[PDB]
Design a protein around this nucleic acid. Structure first.
Lengths: 101, 78, 93, 101, 81
DNA sequence: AGATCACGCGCGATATCAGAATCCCGGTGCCGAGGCCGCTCAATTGGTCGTAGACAGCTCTAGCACCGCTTAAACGCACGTACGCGCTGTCC
């Protein structure tokens, strides 16, 4: 009759994992992250200017840190016999890392 | 503004991290974690820029701030 | 020979904080090691700050920024206040 | 016709937890650890002497590291809905810490 | 000196786990803990002996161990430094 | 057949009979800490000279900002399937 080609759930997830581990471009849009950085900074000092390279460095460091955190989170979830990462996984990863008290 | 870190963007970061399935609440937790990390790094960077008596935050300030926390970053004149 | 330490100064601080409280030798050594460690941390950060700014001298401003970087929030605030007050007293006298 | 007073499993374990978190004395026996330290050092330089203070410092550092590792291990074991720590728990703790590759 | 790693007996590892807040310990944990301890001691004593050799000494002093730990990021108080 | 009362069985709570481990109270000897003494080395006082840093002027680079298009990406909605989670039983 007709039927869509819907991939079994979890297949496009693997395709995306392969696609994003093979690339290097930043995964957060530049402008929203720049606005977030400026807002966080304005707490510490008013009328601050940022070098474009400064925001780019912040984005690179943040994305690398988040990717490593998600790697540890995925390991924690797999340790719990699960496949989904859940906030308790992030909390355990951060607690073991020594980041969160 | 913190919501500018969209759900798909966190999905991409998780995928690059090797994550197959993501819970619904992971996005808010990740936004909080990113906010904390940026707060620390930007606080150190702004401290460096203030000590230099500058109103502009230079990439070198960010690099030094990261190096302080044991997150050395290469590619920005380290 | 002479082995210098912070024993006497830490004891003076203790008696000024808890006049009726002593300190054991092991705790004395731990406190001395802690003072040395914090000294090294602050001095190294001040040296890095001077080097970053193409500056040849470690002033009180460098020490203040190093303290602000090294210490957490409330500890940093109180340490900065104490340092500035001590420097002001020194300059007056 | 009397039965002895057997504590239910897990009671004496909790009593021991309280006792050993209350105290500070070293838990590893001193002579075996000294022999282990000398044997390990024998592979880097022969005919080495050790200050008793050096061996004590090594023992304190090792015991503190192991206690922290066991805390993280217990956290992972609880994360997996378990109460018993297993080697996989230690491996996950070390992997997240960044010690093990 | 041979087979001294087994000198870290099962009860000693049990005590270390208890100080860590562990209630139940698997049987396989003891060998894994011995391996981890051996790795840690190898990493520390390597640097301690490096410091000793640089000082041209045949005796490993507590300050060498303290320097090694500080290098590895495990600063230790109470033995000088 | 239904309701009430009495007896028996099952479950929960308290007590208890105990006995086990811990904490506490007292006496005791100790050695580790606090303190006084003497000696000396490192810090203070005084002075010089030189360069490092402070300050003003100028330049122009880079940051900010604004606009307008286009279009990749976020947002939203829906179906469903497969994964999380609870319950259960067995074995070690």
């Amino acid at each position: 009759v007709k039927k869509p080609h819907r991939y079994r759930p979890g297949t496009v997830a693997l395709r995306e994992i392969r696609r994003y581990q093979k690339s290097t471009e930043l995964l957060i849009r530049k402008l929203p992250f720049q606005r977030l950085v400026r807002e966080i900074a304005q707490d510490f000092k008013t009328d601050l200017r940022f070098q474009s390279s400064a925001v780019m460095a912040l984005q690179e460091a943040s994305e690398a840190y988040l990717v490593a955190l998600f790697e540890d989170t995925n390991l924690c979830a797999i340790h719990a016999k699960r496949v989904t990462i859940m906030p308790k996984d992030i909390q355990l990863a951060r607690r073991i890392r020594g980041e969160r008290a | 503004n913190i919501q500018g870190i969209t759900k798909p963007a966190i999905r991409r970061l998780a995928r690059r991290g090797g994550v197959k399935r993501i819970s619904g609440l992971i996005y808010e937790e990740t936004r909080g974690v990113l906010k904390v990390f940026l707060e620390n790094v930007i606080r150190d960077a702004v401290t460096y820029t203030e000590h230099a008596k500058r109103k502009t935050v230079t990439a070198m300030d960010v690099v030094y701030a990261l190096k302080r926390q044991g997150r050395t970053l290469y590619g920005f004149g380290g | 020979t002479r082995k210098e330490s912070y024993a006497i100064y830490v004891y003076k601080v203790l008696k000024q904080v808890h006049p009726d409280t002593g300190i054991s030798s092991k705790a004395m050594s731990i406190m001395n090691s802690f003072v040395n460690d914090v000294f090294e941390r602050i001095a190294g950060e001040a040296s890095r700050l001077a080097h970053y700014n193409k500056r040849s001298t470690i002033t009180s401003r460098e020490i203040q920024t190093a303290v602000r970087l090294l210490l957490p929030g409330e500890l940093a605030k109180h340490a900065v206040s104490e340092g500035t007050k001590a420097v002001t007293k020194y300059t007056s006298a």
